[PDB]
From a paper:
Vps4, a member of the type-I or meiotic clade of AAA family of proteins (ATPase associated with various activities)11 disassembles ESCRT-III polymers from membranes, which might be coupled to the membrane fission reaction itself. Proteins homologous to Vps4 and ESCRT-III are also present in the Crenarchaeota phylum of archaea where they catalyse final steps in cell division, virus budding and vesicle release. Vps4 contains an amino-terminal microtubule interacting and trafficking (MIT) domain that interacts with carboxy-terminal peptide motifs termed MIT domain-interacting motif in activated eukaryotic and archaeal ESCRT-III proteins. Here we characterized the oligomeric state of the Vps4 homologue from M. sedula (MsVps4) that belongs to the phylum Crenarchaeota.
Numbering used by the authors: 97 to 212, 217 to 363
Amino acid sequence: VTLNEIVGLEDVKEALKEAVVYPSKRPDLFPLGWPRGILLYGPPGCGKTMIAAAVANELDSEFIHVDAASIMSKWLGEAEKNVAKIFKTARELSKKENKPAIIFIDELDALLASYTGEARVRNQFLKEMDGLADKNEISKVYVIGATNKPWRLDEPFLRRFQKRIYITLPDKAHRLELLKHYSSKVKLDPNVNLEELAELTDGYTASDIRDIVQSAHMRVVKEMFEKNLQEPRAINMDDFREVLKVRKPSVNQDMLKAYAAWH
Ligand SMILES: Nc1ncnc2c1ncn2[C@@H]1O[C@H](COP(=O)(O)OP(=O)(O)O)[C@@H](O)[C@H]1O
C-alpha cells in the first residue's frame, strides 16, 4: 500500500513526509530536532491506517502494525508488558537494520480504557514515548497513533504527540474523486452524474463511498444472477438513489462536531 493509492490527503501526505521521511533521510538537516509522535485523529474509514502504511512503505522503513485493543488484557501486568515488548522490538529492528522503525498504533484510546487502576498502562506508554526523544537513544523509532475518539485521550497523553493531524470527512471535491476512483472499476450508464452523487454524499466517509459503489454494483450483479444472465446491465443513477435511501453515513450528527470541537 503506497501514497499514490490514496485519493486525497495531499496536505496530510505532505505533513507526514515532513515529520517522518525527511528527518529519517536527512537527520543533519533538523538541528532543532523533530517530534517522533504523530497522532492521526478523525472519523473512521477516512484513511488513517491507509496513510500510516503508505508512508512506512514510502520510506521502506521497518513496520509494526498494532491494534491497541489487542494489547489490553483483563489480567494485571500483561498490558504494560505487551507495551514494553513492542517498543523493545521496534528499537531492535531499527538498530539491527540501521533504519527507522514505524509503529502504527490503531485505536489508541484503547490503552486508556478499563479492562481490569488503568494508569499503569498509560504510564508505561508515556515512558516509552519520552524514551524515543532521548538524545542518547541510538534507535530511530517513530510512533504514529490513530483514534476516532480523541476526546478519550487525556492531555498528558496528547503531549507526547507533538504533531496532531485531523483527518476529516471528505469535502464535495474529495467525495467526487473518491467517486471517480471507485466507480472507474465498474460499468456506468451515461445518465450517471458523479457531480450530483458528490453532493448527495455529504456526511459520508471514504469507505462509506466505496461501500455505496459496491452496493450499487451489487444491484446489477444481483439482477443478472436471479435471471441467469451472462453479464449485468450498467449502473444507473437510480441504482445510487436506491442505495442512498437505505445507507446512511457511518458518522452521525453530533460525532461530526465532537470532532470539530476537539479539533
Ligand atoms: N483517501 C482515501 N483514498 C482511497 N481509499 C480510502 C481513502 N480513505 C479511506 N479509504 C478506504 O477506506 C478503507 C478504510 O480506511 P482506513 O485507512 O482503515 O480508515 P481509518 O484508518 O481512518 O479508520 C480503506 O481500505 C480504503 O478502502
